């Protein structure tokens, strides 16, 4: 039969965080997989999946939009956030299982591919080497290291890199992430210290990158509109591919964009057309970042179509393990209005052990695989060799 | 291989109009079919398809969104209307061929089904018996016939019927379709004659229908906002499932809806999220009618998702041959936010000859088939036995 | 010291659902309590609280807005929903502990009381007797029972009752809750069956209530704007205190209200001023329902002030155990712009065992207690006598 | 009589495309002509005209707005695009025939002329010499050729030239037209390569043009708002007469204009006041380009009046054969709010064979002819000497 027989979750060590997986098995023995995350502000996703998966057992593996519709009904009052992340993770395992059942790559379920390769940017560059040097080396501890990291990206034929906010001139190099309470300074004001350190960091990065490697700047939720404007004025003459600002104020973000000489990207934390809509109605973004790991890829196709009608291109949010990269590769293959795809090029020493296949890059582009499903499977024995 | 080898068009007599078909053949010998129309104000669709199909030969049958994206590029300046109808017809033949290649019904490509049966309304009731009595009988020529037709719908367990505008008290019964120049009276004013004949007709229909069969009223493009308001005021105390008004004025239609005591439906003539958007932004509709035959079903899924975010349910436009009904059945199977499905229950005497399978209704609902593809194929020998 | 030493969660059987509690202990041995829920579409709240509570240990019990600010930072990306419910539950335990530390009732932290008694409505009336007759009797199985339940409310001096949607004429009496997939009919259409059963039910309720007991109607998320309008038209001549409609479409809900002859209430599922704002900007509500159990009472005071500036009165969402009632009583005591307070008068046979104090009603009003903290404590031994 | 007796279509080779013509004959033997196009994304126009022309036979040649009104009715559902192009082509042949019947130039039907000469810009300069060197020479293959072409325009007393997007530094010189799938890169992203090649091309053009010849830049549909902004920022210090951007997003185009230091033109692909209106309401354009060949000149007068009330000047879209130039010359003669007129100065070697009269330019202006009708007639024998 095509019934779902079981929905299980798994977790393994990823150094400074864990990876999580959904494992869905059908009556025929097909196994669909997804990867999800709890580290990025999302405690409780596993608990959601465990409850929702119980309702799925006995249903058709083929009927993923039925599952979505029922799940949305069952959790309507507390929809969004971690509930919606659980639903998305299950969706992504359903899609894998369905594609495997039909012996096709997942992009074959998504309209077919319309490109073979996807341009990427090397994300958390040099953020991972600065923040998690125990896992991603060589460690970066000063402006010369920042420069060398951009040189390495250039040498390795990557066409774009993304950094965050770093303080260089007040002790050991450290990230500035007050929006996530590191440090706890909840007003999120921007001062001369933030501005001059942003400038110093970005100048070093540009010096290493050369003029032909693009630089993206992610500000996450680390200011208010007032402070974002201050940052954009400071950096008015810099060449930036985008400045990324997460906000729950469509009006405030739109004000910021209207005064920006740089492209503004946002939306990586939002769910469904409903949450994206106020931003598009307000002209708040140049680029919409879609987290397909959170939303589910089928739901993400809906969001992509919605963006397309507003002539907005989309970029996947992708900063997890190899399975997330392959999930996003399939989305990226099928979406016409694709800006670029995020990926982390800094990998854990045991990353390749955890998965059957690793993503392949050539000349700054990700090669889209053609195996049934997403293109890689977590390896159960290897997961258990890396307890969280 | 999975290459498209040929794209052909066919045409046959349908009494007072013709049916048209796209026939797409793959290198493996799989044949995908769609049905399209030129009679509903759409001269030139065949010519579009013939040009676009030439570009498709040699491409992958699996890559339908690639074809769509390329076709949109190639025809961008004159997009919409008959160009977009040609693109939609090809899309629908691509989907059939893809589903057949994967040995699944077309709804398996659309998210899977989430219902097995679809409530319908019996459309052009008694419009077809009044306007085309040579083909659909018994002929209706007076108010007693109108009543009897609604009684027949009731007896046959249909839960809803749709009529149009008819003049009963000025000679032989005849339709009032000034928006389509029958008669040519281009101001489209509404007067006492129109209003009293609408009332007389609908009262007869209600008398026959009983209180539990729902009545839909289609006004097409037959007035201006002024006249639609006059009609809604006249019929303020009638129980109507919807009043259907086509308009290229989102502001005017929204004004009409705001003053309507009945649900308003519209949009059957529109293409893509872009054309629907101004109506939804204006709160112009209770129900959005989506013509999936015109748009292509894949594009129609995008429109349905967009409507869903606005909490608007959708209904397919379906008033052609059996293949169009089966196309729409697959769309209807997969869309959560489904209002109801249109179908014509009055059929040509040779309709079943033209197709391998006929739609099946039970207790006022359409049964969704489970054969690979749409669920029915045109029959080439039978097409040629009915030259247009 | 005033440090938090521990944050624990507890759970007990509540018949057809469970109750959940946060237990927070200070270095001085003061215990603060809250009650939270996972049954109303909210799997995962316990998991959130368990993670967040670990961060709270060692912090000052007095610094609740510091905890809130830090928690919001830590979970910013997946804020709202179950994450925000966990934060609210912890807030409410912090407030209890703070008030106990200062030897005052919780309303003393909220601006002081400005009334001594709170008018209530008897909620889920007769919903609980129809849906959960094993726990709340006497069972209601027909229209005569509906009438008798309203008579009982009248006799017992309650001034208002709230019901939901019930189907009486298609087999055994049963609720109509398609928005929560009972039944699974995800389009949420409204038909003659829904409308005539709403009318029959409400007429029976009114017959029992007399003209001086007010009737509230809760539609939850059980239609689309189209269907809500159909319901409001059907019930246009009924005297209703409010019609309650949950929606994630401020534009659609505002359209519905603009065409309503009844007061419209909404918002019970929303978090923070940010989520309420689009509804108020759109003139979408007469009354804003605030779930203080979900939001935290301190955050709910902010929302109440925001509503006050829009001249909108607020009502607590209160349909859980006695501790939730006492939490809401303290909020209700301090808010000037208070519409009314929800409470369930149907109680479990073991409810009073679970808590130290029970709410007291007189002449249709809740008496606001004056004990330190919320006014009642869960009893640990009794919780364990009722395993979930 | 003044009846239309026949409506015929003709087609001839125009090198890399064909020309098409409508030939309308009256009972008195007067022949009215128009020219139309299928190459610019418009397959099917001939088929539309063939159907509509059948309805016209027997009607008065004088009653062109009657024909328009009836045609709009008959094709209302699929209006716009290729249907509307067919209607426009017939309109333009009706106007020619009417003017010839009354022995006046066509501008005498349009309010009379209010100027004798029309300033032009030399369009597709050097686009035609780069893209179609087999037909328009001398071939342009490098930046020096670009410069020399602008020098030639200067020498020949043209006051303005228009170019498109060209890639010079990646192999043989080639156009960048992703919006029309040359190349197929459907996201339409703009990168450093596009930007530096735009700059290099335009700098060469300016070097040749001198400071007193104006340069127009046409971007067609080749980016999204994000990319148009990137282009405008790159070219912020260039002196451009206009930057032309086609868009189906009035909101997105308006955003772009609001951030442009150059005049923005658009609308060449739009039909009727209805399609122009959302752009004008949004302040999306400095200049409205009106395609009178597509719309019909009578309809184009309506659009011009509408633009006039918004204080927007209009420019004809004119890049076809001599008859299109003469059609547009008559429109340009009568419209007060005229920005400038497009024309191609690069002509096919056989162009003058195809028509009775050629347009005359003096000192950068087109001389408006004073012969009955448009001012030139296609020559039937010459059409047949150039089979398509
Ligand atoms: Mg980010
Ligand atoms: Mg979020
Ligand atoms: Mg219709
Ligand atoms: Mg249309
Ligand atoms: Mg409620
Ligand atoms: Mg909610
Ligand atoms: Mg142009
Ligand atoms: Mg167009």
Q: If DSSP codes are grouped into helix, strand and coil, which group holds residue C179? A: helix
Considering only residues 68 to 97 of chain A, which have any Cβ-Cβ distance to chain C shorter than 8 Å?
A: 69-70, 73-86
**A268 annotated as belonging to a binding site for a ligand:** yes
CB atoms closer than 10 angstroms to residue A156 = 12
- Residue C86: phi and psi, rounded to 5, are -65, -40
CB atoms closer than 10 angstroms to residue C297 = 29
- Which residue on chain D is closest to A281 by alpha carbon? D251
* C114 close to A115: Cβ distance less than 8 angstroms: no
C186 lies within 8 A of chain B by CB: yes
* A310–D186 CB contact, under 8 Å: no
With beta carbons under 8 A apart, name residues in chain B contacting C248: 311
* A73–C40 CB contact, under 8 Å: no
For chain C, give me the number of helices (H) and strands (E)? 14, 15
Q: Can chain D be said to touch chain A, i.e. do they have 3 or more Cβ pairs within 8 angstroms?
A: yes
**A1-103+376-386 shares its CATH topology with A104-375:** no
* B115 close to C186: Cβ distance less than 8 angstroms: no
* B312–C224 CB contact, under 8 Å: yes
User: Is residue B241 classed exposed, middle or buried when 0-12, 13-18 and 19+ CB atoms within 10 A define those classes?
Assistant: buried
Q: Which residues contact A237 (CB under 8 A, 6 or more apart)?
A: none
CB atoms closer than 10 angstroms to residue C344 = 22
B214-218 and B160-163 beta bridge pairing = parallel
Cα dihedral across residues C46, C47, C48, C51: positive or negative? positive
Q: What is the DSSP letter of D378?
A: B
CA terminus-to-terminus distance, chain B? 35
Which residues have C-beta under 5 Å from ligand 7, the single-atom ion? Answer: D 218
* B306 close to B277: Cβ distance less than 8 angstroms: yes
CA terminus-to-terminus distance, chain D? 35
With beta carbons under 8 A apart, name residues in chain B contacting C251: 283, 310
* A90 close to A53: Cβ distance less than 8 angstroms: yes
Provide the β-strand partners of residue B60. B3
* A273–B113 CB contact, under 8 Å: no
* A89 close to A34: Cβ distance less than 8 angstroms: yes
A261 lies within 8 A of chain C by CB: no
The reported resolution of this PDB entry, expressed in Å, is 1.7
**D337 annotated as belonging to a binding site for a ligand:** no
Query: What are the CA-CA distances from residue C188 to residues B309, C177, C196, D302 (Å)?
Result: 14, 9, 16, 46
**C155 annotated as belonging to a binding site for a ligand:** no
* A42–C246 CB contact, under 8 Å: no
With beta carbons under 8 A apart, name residues in chain B contacting C193: none
Please give the Cα distance from D160 to D176 (Å, whole number): 22
The two three-digit tokens of residue A259, written as one number: 């005064």
Cα dihedral across residues A302, A306, A311, A313: positive or negative? negative
- The residue with tokens 């593809």 is B373
Question: How many beta-carbon contacts under 8 Å exist across B and D?
Answer: 138
Q: Which residues of D362-375 are buried (b: 16+ CB within 10 A; e: fewer)?
A: eebbbebbebbbbb
**From D189, D233, D258, residue closest to A339, measured CB to CB:** D189
**A37 annotated as belonging to a binding site for a ligand:** no
* A221 close to A246: Cβ distance less than 8 angstroms: yes
* B63–A309 CB contact, under 8 Å: no
Q: Which of C65, C15, C75 is nearest to C45 (CA)?
A: C75
H helices of D21-172, in order, are 45-56, 64-74, 81-101, 127-131, 143-155
- Which residue on chain D is closest to B83 by alpha carbon? D82
Go through chain A and tell me how many residues it has: 388
**What interhelical angle do B64-74 and B45-56 show, nearest 10?**
120
CB atoms closer than 10 angstroms to residue C141 = 14
Provide the β-strand partners of residue B1. none
Q: For the CA atoms of A250, A252, A257, A261, what is the dihedral angle to 10 degrees? A: -160
Query: What are the CA-CA distances from residue A141 to residues A164, A345, D232, D286 (Å)?
Result: 15, 19, 38, 52
Q: If DSSP codes are grouped into helix, strand and coil, which group holds residue C366? A: strand
Query: What are the CA-CA distances from residue C282 to residues A153, C257, C258 (Å)?
Result: 49, 10, 10
Please give the Cα distance from D146 to B233 (Å, whole number): 66
Q: Which of B316, B325, B319, B326 is nearest to B370 (CA)?
A: B326
- The residue with tokens 């950094």 is A163
Q: What is the DSSP letter of D373?
A: B
Q: Which of C344, C308, C313, C316 is nearest to C332 (CA)?
A: C316
Architecture of domain C104-375: Alpha-Beta Barrel (3.20)
**A162 annotated as belonging to a binding site for a ligand:** yes
Go through chain B and tell me how many residues it has: 388
Chains that touch A (3 or more CB pairs under 8 A): B, C, D
- The residue with tokens 């990646």 is D170
Please give the Cα distance from C260 to C235 (Å, whole number): 10
CA of B204 from ligand 3 middle (Å) equals: 21
To the nearest whole angstrom, how far is the Cα of B329 from the nearest Cα of chain D? 23
Please give the Cα distance from A318 to D281 (Å, whole number): 39
**Experimental determination technique:** X-ray
B63 lies within 8 A of chain D by CB: no
- Residue C148: phi and psi, rounded to 5, are -65, -35
Q: Which residues contact A358 (CB under 8 A, 6 or more apart)?
A: A322, A351, A352, A376
Please give the Cα distance from A335 to A114 (Å, whole number): 8
Provide the β-strand partners of residue B315. B289
* A82–C269 CB contact, under 8 Å: no
Please give the Cα distance from A181 to A179 (Å, whole number): 6
Please give the Cα distance from D86 to A330 (Å, whole number): 42
- Which residue on chain C is closest to A39 by alpha carbon? C75
Q: Which residues of B207-236 are buried (b: 16+ CB within 10 A; e: fewer)?
A: ebbeeebbbbbbbbbbbbbebbbbbbebbe
D309 lies within 8 A of chain B by CB: no
Provide the β-strand partners of residue B219. none
The two three-digit tokens of residue D165, written as one number: 């997007």
- B58 φψ region: left (φ > 0), alpha (ψ -120 to 50), beta (else): left
To the nearest whole angstrom, how far is the Cα of A259 from the nearest Cα of chain C? 23
Query: What are the CA-CA distances from residue B122 to residues B146, B150, B154, B361, C120 (Å)?
Result: 14, 10, 10, 11, 49
Question: How many beta-carbon contacts under 8 Å exist across A and D?
Answer: 43
Q: Can chain D be said to touch chain B, i.e. do they have 3 or more Cβ pairs within 8 angstroms?
A: yes
How many Cα atoms are found within 13 Å in the side-chain-facing hemisphere of B188? Answer: 24
Go through chain D and tell me how many residues it has: 388
Q: What is the 3-state secondary structure (H, E, C) of chain A?
A: CCEEEEEEEEEEECCCCEEEEEEEEECCCCEEEEEECCCCCCCCHHHHHHHHHHHHCCCECCCHHHHHHHHHHHCHHHCCHHHHHHHHHHHHHHHHHHHHHCCCEHHHHCCCCCCCEEEEEECCCCHHHHHCCCCCCCCCCCHHHHHHHHHHHHHCCCCEEEECCEECCCCCCEECEHHHCECCCCCCCCCHHHHHHHHHHHHHHHHHHCCCCEEEEECCCCCCHHHHHHHHHHCCCCCCCEEECCCCCHHHHHHHHHCCCCCEEECCCCCHHHHHHHHHHCCCCCEEEECHHHHCHHHHHHHHHHHHHCCCEEEECCCCCHHHHHHHHHHHHHCCCECCEEECCCCCCCHHHHECCCCCEECCEEECCCCCECCCCECHHHHHCCCC
Listing DSSP states for C191-223 in one string gives -HHHHHHHHHHHHHHHHHH-TTSEEEEE-TT-S
Considering every ligand atom, which ligand is closest to the CA of D79?
4
With beta carbons under 8 A apart, name residues in chain D contacting A337: 186-187, 224
Strand (E) positions, chain D?
4-13, 18-26, 31-36, 117-122, 160-163, 166-167, 174-175, 214-218, 242-244, 264-266, 287-290, 313-316, 341-343, 361-362, 365-367
Q: Which of D68, D118, D124 is nearest to D93 (CA)?
A: D68
Please give the Cα distance from B272 to B76 (Å, whole number): 13
- The residue with tokens 């099928």 is A334
Q: Which of B35, B9, B27, B5 is nearest to B321 (CA)?
A: B35
* D383 close to D8: Cβ distance less than 8 angstroms: no
The two three-digit tokens of residue C48, written as one number: 């959130």
With beta carbons under 8 A apart, name residues in chain D contacting A114: 186
* B189 close to B227: Cβ distance less than 8 angstroms: yes
- Residue B298: phi and psi, rounded to 5, are -70, -45
* C81–A76 CB contact, under 8 Å: no
Which of C185, C224, C227, C252 should one mutate to test binding to chain B, selecting the residue with the greatest count of B CBs within 10 A? C224
Please give the Cα distance from A315 to A317 (Å, whole number): 7
Please give the Cα distance from B244 to B225 (Å, whole number): 13
* B248 close to B278: Cβ distance less than 8 angstroms: no
- Residue B313: phi and psi, rounded to 5, are -90, 155
Helix (H) or strand (E) holding C316: strand C313-316
**From A41, A75, A81, residue closest to C41, measured CB to CB:** A75
The two three-digit tokens of residue B252, written as one number: 């005017």
Q: Which of D346, D329, D279, D337 is nearest to D308 (CA)?
A: D337
CA angle A281, A283, A288 (to 5 degrees): 95
To the nearest whole angstrom, how far is the Cα of A72 from the nearest Cα of chain C? 8
CATH superfamily, region D1-103+376-386: Enolase-like, N-terminal domain (3.30.390.10)
Considering every ligand atom, which ligand is closest to the CA of A244?
1
B111 lies within 8 A of chain A by CB: yes
Domains of chain A, by residue range, sit at 1-103+376-386, 104-375
CA of D215 from ligand 7 middle (Å) equals: 14
How many Cα atoms are found within 13 Å in the side-chain-facing hemisphere of B296? Answer: 31
């Amino acid at each position: 039969s095509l019934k779902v027989v079981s929905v299980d979750t798994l977790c393994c060590d990823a150094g400074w965080r864990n990876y999580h997986f959904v494992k869905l098995t059908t009556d025929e023995g097909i196994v669909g997989w997804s990867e999800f995350d709890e580290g990025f502000g999302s405690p409780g996703v596993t608990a959601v999946i465990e409850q929702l998966g119980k309702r799925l057992v006995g249903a058709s593996v083929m009927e993923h939009e039925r599952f979505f519709a029922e799940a949305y009904c069952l959790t309507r009052p507390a929809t969004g956030g971690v509930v919606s992340e659980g639903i998305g993770a299950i969706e992504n395992a359903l899609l894998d299982a369905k594609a495997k059942t039909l012996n096709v790559p997942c992009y074959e379920l998504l309209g077919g591919k319309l490109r073979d390769r996807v341009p990427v940017y090397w994300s958390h560059c040099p953020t991972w080497r600065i923040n998690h040097p125990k896992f991603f080396g060589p460690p970066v501890t000063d402006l010369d290291g920042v420069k060398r990291t951009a040189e390495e990206a250039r040498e390795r034929q990557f066409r774009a890199i993304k950094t965050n906010i770093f303080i260089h001139d007040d002790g050991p190099l450290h990230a500035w992430r007050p929006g996530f309470a590191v440090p706890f300074q909840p007003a999120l004001n921007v001062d001369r210290k933030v501005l001059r350190n942003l400038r110093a960091h970005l100048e070093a990065l540009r010096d290493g990158a050369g003029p032909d490697v693009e630089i993206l700047l992610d500000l996450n939720f680390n200011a208010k509109p007032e402070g974002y404007l201050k940052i954009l004025r400071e950096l008015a003459d810099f060449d930036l591919f985008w400045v990324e600002i997460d906000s729950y104020s469509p009006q405030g973000l739109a004000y910021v964009r209207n005064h920006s000489p740089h492209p503004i990207s946002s939306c990586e934390t939002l769910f469904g057309i409903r949450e994206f809509k106020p931003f598009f109605d307000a002209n708040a973004v140049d680029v919409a970042i879609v987290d397909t790991i959170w939303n589910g890829v089928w739901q993400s196709m809906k969001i992509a179509a919605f963006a397309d009608a507003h002539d907005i291109n989309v970029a996947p949010h992708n900063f997890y393990g190899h399975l997330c990269t392959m999930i996003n590769a399939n989305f990226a293959a099928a979406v016409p209005n694709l800006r670029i795809m995020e990926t982390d090029i800094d990998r854990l020493a045991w990353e390749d052990e955890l998965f059957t296949h690793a993503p392949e890059y050539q000349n700054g582009e990700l090669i889209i695989p053609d195996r049934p499903g997403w293109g890689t499977d977590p390896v159960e024995e290897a997961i258990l060799a890396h307890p969280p």
